[PDB]
Design a binder for this molecule. Structure first.
Ligand SMILES: [Zn+2]
Ligand SMILES: [Zn+2]
Lengths: 468, 76, 76
């Protein structure tokens, strides 16, 4: 099987950390005893020294390869990187062949200790431009209600975190949803039918749906104060209703891995939320879900509770056997061992954090999508920017009826403009594929003149001039 | 008599409105079924925004026509 | 022969025309089933506005070829 091009590059590099000679070393200069030996990239002591709170899963893959492959014979190639299962094997390899009549300890799911995950799949989410997500908050500034979107992007290496993958996003697509002041809830059938055609155009453009965003602002008084502070240390970090939508999105998009026995493991999916800081701004934060316990129990046992920090655990009806969930908390006198014989266990423990950021404006490798970021989006029907062909006379117009190719190609690289053109499918699919590849790639000057000489682009500007 | 109000998520809401009442009573009837205040509500009739102070006869809205519902706060 | 008459709203309707017929027979066919007068029947092929008093041999209209129709919409 074949993995991603980014995932195979992190596997080949060892990522060792070099050290220097010290006063504690008693050996010679041409050697190393223990104090200047090469440090492994999975040691968590070096991680918390530089305030890195997770061990960068590609290095966690290396720390399990040392346990799988040894100096001894072995002759196995097991590679035990699989999803730990809480479901019940029906055959059970014993005399209690039905679960209605019989269950023993080798098939019973053990009591969940609630230990936090030490490794994250995505180590650092990054963005492309501050003007891209400024249009997303501007949707709230016009209708006053919450929004929703899906992030399309790619992946590359990250040199800050040892053996880490960074998440790059390029554009944000919004599905048609019904907004509300308190929260939001849309139909999953019309979104999945709409997201199927966007994945078609994302393949030729080199994009993949790897993220989503949802807003939560609660403006205070619209004067000096920006927003309220809903999510803090004493309150919930992520609501339990949005854990369900984050869990189903990770199971729909698996990550291919040759080390896993099933063929897919350790999904690379980000969930970002606009919530605001403690003091005064609308700074965002992102956390992703845990694979070890939460990713498998969401198929059978997650039920909604009235508290945003916790989630209710329901009962067993003849196939849905669940084990007891335990966690430690302080009582009125001291700190005690596991107490939970009670439902509504918290879900903030099962989240691992990420580091969001925006790159510097002075230099970058590329940006690939900065045309205007002011074009009316596809499914923004709550706002007034959902126009017909009247907008195409205002937006591009083949500027001033005779456009220069340095000023014409800079507008054609928009994500939602190219996704609006092919829906009319005036051009051929072969000429459309070279149209979107010219706008997204470099050395575009020889191929842009091929587009203007084609009869399909001439019919597009002729059918636009007669219409309003 | 019959009317059809449809949101952006592809969900049509059935409602029985009088042929000679105001648009504000239509916004009050959709308030009771869901719990949305009618101040931020707006009704689009084939690209034309219905004014709440008028009636159903001057806009020539016929029986069981497809309507649109959108929410937009004035200050927000 | 088979052609693809497509208007500005993406609605494609199959019509019939001879390879040596004038375009006014197509304009009369739109006037029959759509009821559009010829002052708003604007066909465009190869980036040029097709005049109503020409034939298909000048624009080289072949079999199974699409057509781009523009309909005028105004309030005045
Ligand atoms: Zn040493
Ligand atoms: Zn068993």
């Amino acid at each position: 099987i074949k993995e991603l091009a980014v995932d195979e590059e992190l596997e080949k590099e060892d990522g060792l950390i070099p050290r220097q000679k010290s006063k504690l070393c008693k050996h010679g200069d041409r050697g190393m005893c223990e104090y200047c030996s090469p440090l492994p990239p999975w040691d968590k002591e070096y991680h918390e020294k530089n305030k890195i709170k997770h061990i960068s899963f590609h290095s966690y893959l290396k720390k399990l390869n040392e346990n799988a492959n040894k100096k001894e014979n072995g002759s196995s190639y097991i590679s035990p990187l699989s999803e730990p299962d809480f479901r019940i094997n029906k055959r059970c390899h014993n005399g209690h062949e039905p679960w209605p009549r019989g269950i023993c300890s080798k098939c019973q799911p053990s009591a969940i200790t609630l230990q936090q995950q030490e490794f994250r799949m995505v180590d650092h989410v990054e963005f492309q431009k501050s003007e891209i997500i400024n249009e997303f908050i501007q949707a709230w500034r016009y209708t006053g209600m919450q929004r929703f979107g899906y992030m399309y992007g790619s992946y590359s290496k990250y040199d800050n975190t040892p053996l880490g993958i960074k998440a790059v996003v390029e554009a944000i697509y919004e599905p048609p949803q019904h907004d509300e002041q308190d929260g939001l809830t849309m139909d999953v059938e019309q979104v999945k039918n709409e997201m199927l055609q966007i994945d078609r155009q994302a393949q030729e453009m080199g994009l993949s749906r790897i993220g989503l965003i949802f807003t939560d602002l609660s403006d205070a008084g619209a004067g000096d104060g920006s927003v309220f502070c809903k999510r803090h240390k004493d309150s919930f970090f992520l609501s339990s209703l949005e854990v369900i939508m984050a869990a189903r999105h990770q199971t729909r998009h698996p990550n291919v891995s040759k080390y896993s026995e099933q063929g897919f493991f350790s999904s690379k999916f980000v969930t970002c939320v606009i919530s605001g800081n403690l003091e005064g701004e609308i700074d965002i934060s992102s956390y992703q879900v845990s694979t070890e316990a939460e990713a498998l129990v969401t198929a059978d046992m997650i039920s909604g509770s009235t508290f945003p920090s916790m989630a209710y655990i329901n009962d067993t009806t003849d196939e849905r056997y669940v084990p007891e969930i335990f966690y430690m908390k302080s009582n009125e006198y001291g700190i005690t061992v596991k107490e939970n014989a009670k439902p509504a266990f918290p879900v903030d423990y099962l989240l691992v954090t990420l580091t969001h950021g925006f790159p510097n404006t002075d230099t970058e490798t590329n940006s690939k999508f900065v045309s205007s970021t002011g074009f009316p989006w596809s499914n923004r029907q709550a706002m007034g920017q959902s126009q017909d062909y009247q907008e195409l006379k205002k937006y591009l117009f083949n500027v001033a009826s005779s456009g220069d190719f340095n000023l014409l190609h800079e507008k054609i690289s928009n994500f939602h403009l190219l996704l609006y053109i092919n829906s009319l499918q005036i051009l051929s699919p072969d000429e459309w594929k070279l149209l979107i590849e010219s706008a997204v790639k470099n050395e575009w000057e020889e191929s842009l003149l091929k587009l203007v000489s084609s009869a399909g682009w001439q019919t597009l500007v002729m059918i636009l001039q007669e219409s309003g | 008599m019959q009317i059809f109000v449809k949101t952006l998520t592809g969900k049509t809401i059935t409602l029985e409105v009088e042929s000679s009442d105001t648009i504000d009573n239509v916004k009050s009837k959709i308030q009771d079924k869901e719990g949305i205040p009618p101040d931020q509500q707006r009704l689009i009739f084939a690209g034309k925004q219905l004014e709440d102070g008028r009636t159903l006869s001057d806009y020539n809205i016929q029986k069981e026509s497809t309507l649109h519902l959108v929410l937009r706060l004035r200050g927000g």
